[PDB]
């Protein structure tokens, strides 16, 4: 039952926790209410950690929509980069990266809501409480990528946001 200081599972834990931290910061910096995100933190954690460990998680998706129209105002994708090696490489959680992009994302509508989904590889293990979902349309939108947002020894989440035109 040896526990290694540097390991894939430590890197997975770091990236899991700080992807969720980063999404919470996006919600806060966007002026939204984090309660709904709080209420599902543990279930979001269990699923993200599981599917990272098997290489099955493709993206973490946070839809931010206008409740009056149900349309996306923006969508934040955290694409997973499976470039891990050794486990003793450099790491970071670049909150300042998100604050620079969120200025460019633009003001959100009053009382905008959000929804988290997980993009997975078909052969993924089932995780209790998770079912096939649906995307809100991104027609007329393109994605802006920001670079490595959450990093630990090559395993990374790279944030991006969808915008109009």
């Amino acid at each position: 039952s040896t526990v290694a200081t540097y390991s894939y599972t430590h890197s997975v834990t770091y990236v899991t926790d700080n992807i969720l931290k980063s999404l919470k910061d996006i919600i806060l910096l966007s002026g939204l209410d984090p309660e709904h995100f709080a209420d599902r933190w543990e279930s979001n954690t269990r699923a993200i950690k599981t599917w990272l460990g098997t290489g099955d998680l493709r993206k973490v998706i946070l839809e931010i929509y206008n409740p009056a129209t149900d349309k996306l105002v923006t969508r934040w994708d955290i694409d997973i980069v499976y470039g891990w090696s050794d486990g003793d490489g450099s790491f970071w959680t670049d909150t300042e990266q998100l604050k620079y992009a969120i200025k460019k994302a633009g003001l959100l509508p009053s009382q905008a809501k959000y929804k988290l989904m997980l993009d997975t590889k078909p052969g993924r293990p089932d995780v209790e409480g998770w079912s096939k979902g649906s995307y809100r349309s991104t027609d007329g939108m393109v994605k802006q990528s920001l670079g490595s947002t959450v990093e630990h020894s090559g395993l990374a989440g790279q944030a991006g946001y969808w915008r109009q035109r």
Binding site: R40, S43, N44, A47, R58, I61, K115, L116, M117, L118, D119, T120, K121, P122, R124, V127, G129, W130, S131, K132, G133, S134, Y135
Partner: peptide, 7 residues
Amino acid sequence: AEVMEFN
């Protein structure tokens, strides 16, 4: 890929 939501 298959997108998943919580239930």
